[PDB]
């Protein structure tokens, strides 16, 4: 529901959070576009990145004890 109407970007934020997706603009056309964050990958065709294939540096090398 959209009673007591608010800023449009906030409502789109709410809807995107519900669906868990990303609104974005296509790099080529420039048209507004929508993306969903899902399991749409086969873990086989993915490109492998190491220093010998395009990786320059890992700017985040620490671990912040993310166990809790």
């Amino acid at each position: 529901r959209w009673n007591r109407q608010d800023t449009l970007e906030s409502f789109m934020q709410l809807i995107l959070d519900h669906i868990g997706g990303a609104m974005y603009v296509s790099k080529v056309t420039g048209k507004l576009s929508l993306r969903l964050i899902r399991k749409d990958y086969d873990f086989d065709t993915l490109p492998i990145f190491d220093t010998d294939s395009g990786l320059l540096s890992i700017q985040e090398a620490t671990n912040a004890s993310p166990a809790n």
């Binding site: 109407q5 800023t7 449009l8 970007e9 789109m12 990303a22 609104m23 974005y24 603009v25 790099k27 080529v28 056309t29 420039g30 507004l32 395009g54």
Partner: protein, 135 residues
């Protein structure tokens, strides 16, 4: 054949062309130093220079800041009274010996302000994602 040259480690060519568009009133620019001609149009070498096509999903930060020479009519459109109709900017990314300039940015000209660097003004160009503050 663009991607093969683009992803090469020891092969490449510099070009970043800019199309300033206003209901088909066109200016075809080139950040390189040469008379680049592609896509059926000549992209003149002008002092335009990108600051990075950032895509963060955050408004303001992604504002593409172009250093555009003031003498251009593109800036001239904004002297005193800017256009009543939005102006769109398209950037293309071909190499040389190549002929498919994969478009990389389709932002619009939101605001312009001259300043300390009189030879080039600052042009701010966001995209549709960040213009959603409407009531």
């Amino acid at each position: 054949s663009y991607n093969i040259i683009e992803t090469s480690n020891d092969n490449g060519r510099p070009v970043f062309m800019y199309e300033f568009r206003l209901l088909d009133k066109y200016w075809r620019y080139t950040s390189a130093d040469a008379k680049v001609s592609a896509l059926g149009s000549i992209w003149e070498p002008m002092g335009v220079s990108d600051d990075g096509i950032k895509q963060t999903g955050e408004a303001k930060t992604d504002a593409l800041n172009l250093t555009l020479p003031n003498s251009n009519p593109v800036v001239g459109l904004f002297i005193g009274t800017p256009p009543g109709s939005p102006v769109t900017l398209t950037i293309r990314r071909m190499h040389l010996d190549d002929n498919d300039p994969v478009v990389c940015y389709v932002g619009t000209v939101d605001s312009i302000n001259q300043g300390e660097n009189p030879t080039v003004a600052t042009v701010t160009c966001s995209t549709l994602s960040a213009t959603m503050d409407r009531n």
